[PDB]
Design a protein around this ligand. Structure first.
Ligand SMILES: Nc1nc2c(ncn2[C@@H]2O[C@H](COP(=O)(O)OP(=O)(O)OP(=O)(O)O)[C@@H](O)[C@H]2O)c(=O)[nH]1
Ligand SMILES: O=C([O-])C(=O)[O-]
Ligand SMILES: [Mn+2]
Ligand SMILES: [Mn+2]
Ligand code: NA
Length: 619
């Protein structure tokens, strides 16, 4: 070097650039040159590091300690930074069609492509100087069990201590991962809240963010993820949606595996027979509650492998094996109670970070549906940091408030949840929020029909992103926000699985926990009662003659579902299938797939469309 090169050793306040693998050092120093942090902190993942970082944020007023619990914390964000923003989430490729199919008219509903040229301009308008006056934290993280050959390692640079703390829970993080990495490749992840000091704009709720310039970008051809302006975990915990769904789904297509928005659970019957199941439901549509359900049926047991992301690959014996690449649960808080999700309540009692929930005056947490009466005199601070009472018009917790909690604390975490070879999946469940028309459970007729059922998924909008109201949206495979490449090609890749050597193709089901009667009341109580539906699925996988053929697939025979203790359920409305509803449903799906998937729609999916239309027509 003729001066100091890109040597940023003088600014390192933890660790050493010298001890980094060469390529990690280059990534760090290149982005230090660009972003101009004051300091560089190389994370070690230690308890000491964690506790001190938390106590620092506390003194600053960035987070509060929840004094009622063992090592739990509460962050309240700027109300502009509360969920994913799909319209600001983009994938960069040379050709648009590699990222999304070209629709018959208008822009794709299956992702958002940005050209290399446009992204360069966007990047230059955001990143230079962005970390001035701040610390750049270097987070070495593993997606998958540490030192597993299945794992994928990343390095996330961020100026947000909230992100460091959340990454420690949600991934395997620290020096151990650098030691496991060695001179290997890693996913390059760059994050900034986009508020260099001195602040050009007023800071809201001590929550640094830049809503106007928020942009969550993926550059799969450069193995980079670059996210600006948002601290919300879906936008800032780059291992999770960005890497483990978007980047990984494209790698998966190329390499013969699958990366999916699915829980993985193990279920054991009263005879001690155990099976694993995967389930894809859209954001805020029930995965975490199923994955750690407490079954109401006696003698059944559920165990949790993962609640959100599954990586799956057929082995040589033909088993579809699944691993959970995450290390924690980043779960929707509202609705969570001892009644609905007791295993989550137990998990989150210690070492948990909450975002955008309410705080009680004795230092506990509160949210809609927590179903815990407070002692007279105890008062509530809403997520907006204002005094709140139960009869107030607005909720005390944001609808997308979250807990972020170690998976190892789940009282029913599966013994094999960190096994590198993964667990053998025998059933795949699809489903979402449909208040009308769609019955409690049905079973696909074949693998190709089941891929069609995944493709045809529709679900009421939730608060997990920017969609408002109760519009029923397409959300194929619960992947609409997450495809890393062209969805037509994704469908072809799923179809191609039918030919894996020795393949033991999982049975495919579709569920609906959310059908309502004419008064808006849920027809099905859900939560632990969903064990009744899992029982039926389990018997179907065992080959039990417990099903009746219908135009949409198989449903339970009369008396097949165990409804003991649920004698008030209206089985007729709940399982009702209307020709008029389904004729309209099939035409809507046909228009969506042909318009949005277009030249890239596989023949087999169009054939399943035709077949469903025909069976409905014979009603
Ligand atoms: N009525 C009803 N509500 C449910 C059921 N399961 C979950 N919910 C509610 O739906 C909301 C979201 O459920 P989660 O299990 O957190 O959803 P998720 O699929 O894990 O969502 P992401 O983490 O955003 O992917 C919570 O408010 C739950 O209480 C159910 O069986 N019936
Ligand atoms: O945060 C999530 O898990 C989501 O939006 O699906
Ligand atoms: Mn999710
Ligand atoms: Mn979840
Ligand atoms: Na705050």
């Amino acid at each position: 070097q003729l001066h100091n090169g890109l040597d940023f050793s003088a600014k390192v306040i933890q660790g050493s650039l010298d001890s980094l693998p060469q390529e990690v050092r280059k990534f760090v120093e290149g982005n230090a040159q660009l972003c101009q942090p004051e300091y560089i902190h190389i994370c070690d993942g230690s308890e000491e590091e964690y506790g001190r970082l938390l106590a620092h944020m506390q003194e600053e007023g960035v987070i509060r300690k929840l004094k009622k619990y063992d090592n739990c914390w509460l962050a309240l964000t700027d109300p502009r930074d509360v969920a994913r923003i799909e319209s600001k989430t983009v994938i960069i490729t040379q050709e648009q069609r590699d990222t999304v199919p070209i629709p018959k008219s208008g822009q794709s509903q299956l992702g958002r492509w940005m050209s290399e040229e446009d992204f360069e301009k966007a990047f230059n308008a955001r990143f230079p100087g962005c970390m001035k006056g701040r610390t750049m934290y270097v987070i070495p993280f593993s997606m998958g069990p540490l030192g597993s050959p299945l794992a994928k390692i990343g390095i996330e640079l961020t100026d947000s201590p909230y992100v460091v703390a959340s990454m420690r829970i949600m991934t395997r993080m620290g020096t151990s991962v650098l030691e496991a990495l060695g001179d290997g490749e890693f996913i390059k992840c760059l994050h900034s809240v986009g508020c260099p000091l001195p602040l050009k704009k007023p800071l809201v709720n001590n929550w640094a963010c830049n809503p106007e310039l928020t942009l969550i970008a993926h550059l799969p051809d450069r193995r980079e993820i670059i996210s600006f302006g948002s601290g919300y975990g879906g936008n800032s915990l780059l291992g999770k949606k960005c890497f483990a769904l978007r980047i990984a789904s494209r790698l998966a297509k190329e390499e013969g595996w699958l990366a999916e928005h699915m829980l993985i659970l193990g279920i054991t019957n009263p005879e001690g027979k155990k099976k694993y199941l995967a389930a894809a439901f859209p954001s805020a549509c029930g995965k975490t509650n199923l994955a750690m359900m407490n079954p109401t049926l006696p003698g059944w047991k559920v165990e949790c492998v993962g609640d959100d992301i599954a990586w799956m690959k057929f082995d040589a014996q033909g088993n579809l094996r699944a691993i959970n690449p995450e290390n924690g649960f980043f779960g929707v808080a509202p609705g969570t109670s001892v009644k609905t999700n007791p295993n989550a309540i137990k998990t989150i009692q210690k070492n948990t970070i909450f975002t955008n929930v309410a705080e009680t005056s004795d230092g506990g947490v509160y949210w809609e549906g927590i179903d815990e009466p407070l002692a007279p005199g105890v008062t509530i601070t809403s997520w907006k940091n204002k005094e709140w009472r139960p009869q107030d018009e607005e909720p005390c917790a944001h609808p997308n408030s979250r807990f972020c909690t170690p998976a190892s604390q789940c009282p029913i975490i599966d013994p094999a949840w960190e096994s590198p070879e993964g667990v053998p999946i025998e059933g795949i469940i699809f489903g979402g929020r449909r208040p009308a028309g769609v019955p409690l459970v049905y079973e696909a007729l074949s693998w190709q029909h089941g891929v069609f059922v995944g493709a045809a998924m529709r679900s009421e909008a939730t608060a997990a992103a920017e969609h408002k109201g109760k519009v029923i949206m397409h959300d194929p495979f619960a992947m609409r926000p997450f495809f890393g490449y062209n969805f037509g090609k994704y469908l072809a890749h799923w179809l191609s699985m039918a030919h894996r050597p020795a393949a033991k193709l999982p049975k495919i089901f579709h569920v609906n926990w959310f059908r309502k009667d004419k008064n808006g009341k849920f027809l099905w109580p859900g939560f632990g009662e969903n064990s009744r539906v899992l029982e039926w699925m389990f018997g179907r996988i065992e080959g039990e003659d417990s099903a009746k053929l219908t135009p949409i697939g198989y449903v339970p025979k009369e008396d097949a579902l165990n409804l003991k203790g649920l004698g008030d359920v209206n089985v007729e409305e709940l399982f009702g299938i209307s020709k008029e509803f389904w004729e309209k449903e099939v035409e809507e799906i046909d228009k969506y797939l042909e318009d949005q998937v277009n030249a890239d729609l596989p023949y087999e999916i169009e054939r399943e469309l035709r077949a469903l239309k025909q069976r409905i027509s014979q009603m």
